[PDB]
Write a protein that binds this ligand. Structure first.
Ligand SMILES: Nc1ncnc2c1ncn2[C@@H]1O[C@H](COP(=O)(O)OP(=O)(O)O)[C@@H](O)[C@H]1O
Ligand SMILES: Nc1ncnc2c1ncn2[C@@H]1O[C@H](COP(=O)(O)OP(=O)(O)O)[C@@H](O)[C@H]1O
Ligand SMILES: [Mg+2]
Length: 290
């Protein structure tokens, strides 16, 4: 039977942000920090922002999309707590990043998004927190449309770090699943959902990332068939699937069935080209035999 482990490793390589874009992302994220720091020093020095890279970039699971888009999440914290609405802190950050050359900001519900014409964006979730060095205190996320929400971005990173330890295939599995979401889109869940599901339900097959992904898909399906949910570690009741009606759930679980069916056929294929086409159908066009 065809062995596609090498093709999976090369696919993982193709999913990485390119050298040029990663340097531009980091340079831009440093420029944004200085721009925000200068804005508050000039206009509201009573509040001092501090920063913490979070999300996939901090966890080491970032992929570029099929359009070569990529991003970085940089949390913007105000300590101690400003006694203003969350939308007020967001508006100031939005005003601060406005005017960045080659970029246009967008005020999302839970972050300020800075879209760069060069093909990347930086998301700036805004937080307030009372104490500078207290990991037992969870920060409050600013929300445009409502009240602050308790959040635990650092706890997610710690949790995933413990799952990654002695387990380097996990970041590859998360990357494969994120590329699956990036290929189908529409009803598909976000990358954080793939991080949680792969970490909880991972199955291992040393030397065969193709078999490992197949086994992990079936493990995820078994868990979600019993209880269709995806709770964020450290934040109970933060269920990433809580808004999914029966239609969206059925669409996702049907796509998971089809992925599993084709993965089974690929693993049992003698023809390496056919096997690669079955995987590529769901993982996207950066997967190939050549
Ligand atoms: N429902 C949520 N609860 C808590 N944190 C969230 C939630 N959604 C997003 N985040 C935070 O934003 C980060 C990025 O979310 P997401 O867009 O799914 O990841 P990616 O950076 O891979 O696109 C997550 O790592 C998490 O810290
Ligand atoms: N609970 C959260 N904690 C931290 N960041 C978040 C959270 N939820 C969303 N984000 C960030 O905000 C981005 C988009 O926010 P979203 O909720 O999609 O706003 P909108 O509904 O306007 O699209 C996400 O990609 C993520 O990076
Ligand atoms: Mg994001």
């Amino acid at each position: 039977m065809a062995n596609l482990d090498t093709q999976f490793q090369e696919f993982y390589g193709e999913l990485q942000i390119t050298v040029t874009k990663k340097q531009a992302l980091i340079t831009s994220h440093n420029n944004l920090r200085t721009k925000i720091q200068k804005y508050f020093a000039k206009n509201h020095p009573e509040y001092v922002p501090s920063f913490y890279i979070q999300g996939s970039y901090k966890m080491g699971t970032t992929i570029r999309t099929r359009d070569d888009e990529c991003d970085l999440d940089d949390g913007c914290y105000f300590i101690p707590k400003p006694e203003v609405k969350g939308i007020t802190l967001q508006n100031w950050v939005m005003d601060a990043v406005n005017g960045t050359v080659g970029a246009t900001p967008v005020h999302k519900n839970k972050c300020i998004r800075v879209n760069y014409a060069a093909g990347y964006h930086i998301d700036l979730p805004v937080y307030r927190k009372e104490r500078c060095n207290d990991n037992t205190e969870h920060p409050e996320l600013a929300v445009r449309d409502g009240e602050y929400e308790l959040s635990d971005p650092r706890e997610i990173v710690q949790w995933f770090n413990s799952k990654k330890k002695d387990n380097p295939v996990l970041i590859r599995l998360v990357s494969y699943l994120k590329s699956w979401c990036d290929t189908v889109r529409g009803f598909m869940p976000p990358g954080l959902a793939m991080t949680i599901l792969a970490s909880k339900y991972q199955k291992k097959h040393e030397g065969r990332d193709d078999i490992a992904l197949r086994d992990t898909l079936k493990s995820i399906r078994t868990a979600l068939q019993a209880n269709f949910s995806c709770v964020v570690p450290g934040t109970p009741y933060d269920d990433l699937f809580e808004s999914y009606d029966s239609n969206r759930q059925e669409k996702f679980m049907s796509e998971l069935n089809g992925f599993i069916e084709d993965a089974d056929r690929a693993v049992n294929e003698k023809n390496k080209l056919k096997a690669s086409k079955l995987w590529k159908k769901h993982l996207g066009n950066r997967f190939h035999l050549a």
